[PDB]
Swiss-Prot record:
This is Dual specificity protein kinase CLK3. Dual specificity kinase acting on both serine/threonine and tyrosine-containing substrates. Phosphorylates serine- and arginine-rich (SR) proteins of the spliceosomal complex. May be a constituent of a network of regulatory mechanisms that enable SR proteins to control RNA splicing and can cause redistribution of SR proteins from speckles to a diffuse nucleoplasmic distribution. Phosphorylates SRSF1 and SRSF3. Regulates the alternative splicing of tissue factor (F3) pre-mRNA in endothelial cells. Keywords: ATP-binding, Cytoplasm, Cytoplasmic vesicle, Kinase, Nucleotide-binding, Nucleus, Phosphoprotein, Serine/threonine-protein kinase, Transferase, Tyrosine-protein kinase. GO terms for biological process: protein phosphorylation; regulation of RNA splicing. It comes from Homo sapiens (Human). It catalyses: L-seryl-[protein] + ATP = O-phospho-L-seryl-[protein] + ADP + H(+); L-threonyl-[protein] + ATP = O-phospho-L-threonyl-[protein] + ADP + H(+); L-tyrosyl-[protein] + ATP = O-phospho-L-tyrosyl-[protein] + ADP + H(+). Endothelial cells. GO terms for cellular component: acrosomal vesicle; intermediate filament cytoskeleton; membrane; nuclear speck; nucleoplasm; nucleus.
Length: 262
């Protein structure tokens, strides 16, 4: 099943992706390894900004060429060089914050058959869970979750099951748009428009204690933090038709803080 090779060849011909030589180039540790190798202490905002910029550029490229990745997660984003400079206050900070997007094994073309369920759970969007169909906006959702993870050090949706996941989504982002609820065949999750959920269950207890409205995860109050969260909340729009595109995301005030080298 090296129809992966095919995608890689189609991609090369059109580029912050890890692509083929014939296997490919070796790079540094991935952005999750680095997180774990640093106690899950977040990346500082400037790193998060440069990484976000690169991600949006990388996938805007796929997205404008009839491709969705479907499996973006911190494990598939690679530092070109993960050499770091430890500093006491001990936290680690990577030297060169350039990244590459990897693993096009799941990348799907517009015209290809779309499997119902795609993405790794924590990075999977509501349209997929509710089986409303999916395309490029899938990746944008994943990118929102990933940026949050870079900025706080922990997963946005640390979940194991659909119902819980949906409850976490409402907890953090507000209620699911009613039209999406009317449209899904997955009605077993709902009653009179409301997610069926026992708050006294162990998971229900986890969510009450640990999931809160998105803005409340802001570490600092500076403009740059406010903008990152404005951009994240647009990437984590429930409705894929209304969710921001990566072309649009790059025209966001958040990226004003980039160096011109960056």
């Amino acid at each position: 099943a090296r129809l992966e090779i095919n995608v890689l060849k189609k991609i090369k011909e059109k580029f912050l992706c890890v692509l083929m030589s014939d296997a490919f180039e070796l790079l540094g540790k991935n952005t999750f390894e680095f997180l774990k190798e640093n106690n899950f202490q977040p990346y500082p905002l400037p790193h998060v900004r440069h990484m976000a910029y690169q991600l949006c550029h990388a996938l805007r490229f796929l997205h404008e060429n009839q491709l969705t990745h479907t499996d973006l997660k911190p494990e598939n984003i690679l530092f070109v060089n993960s050499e770091f400079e430890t500093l006491y206050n001990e936290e680690k900070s990577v030297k060169n914050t350039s990244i590459r997007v990897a693993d096009f094994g799941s990348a799907t073309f517009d015209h290809e058959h779309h499997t119902t369920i795609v993405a790794t759970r924590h990075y999977r969007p509501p349209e997929v869970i509710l089986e409303l169909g999916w395309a490029q906006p899938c990746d944008v959702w994943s990118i929102g979750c990933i940026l949050f993870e870079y900025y706080r050090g922990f997963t946005l949706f640390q979940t194991h099951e659909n119902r819980e996941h949906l409850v976490m989504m409402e907890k953090i982002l507000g209620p699911i748009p009613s039209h999406m609820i009317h449209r899904t065949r997955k009605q077993k999750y709902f009653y009179k428009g409301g997610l069926v959920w026992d708050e006294n269950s162990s998971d229900g207890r986890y969510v009450k204690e640990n999931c809160k409205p998105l803005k409340s995860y802001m570490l600092q109050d500076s403009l740059e933090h406010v903008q990152l969260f404005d951009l994240m909340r647009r990437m984590l729009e429930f409705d894929p038709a209304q969710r921001i595109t990566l072309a649009e995301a790059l025209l966001h005030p958040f990226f004003a803080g980039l160096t011109p080298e960056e």
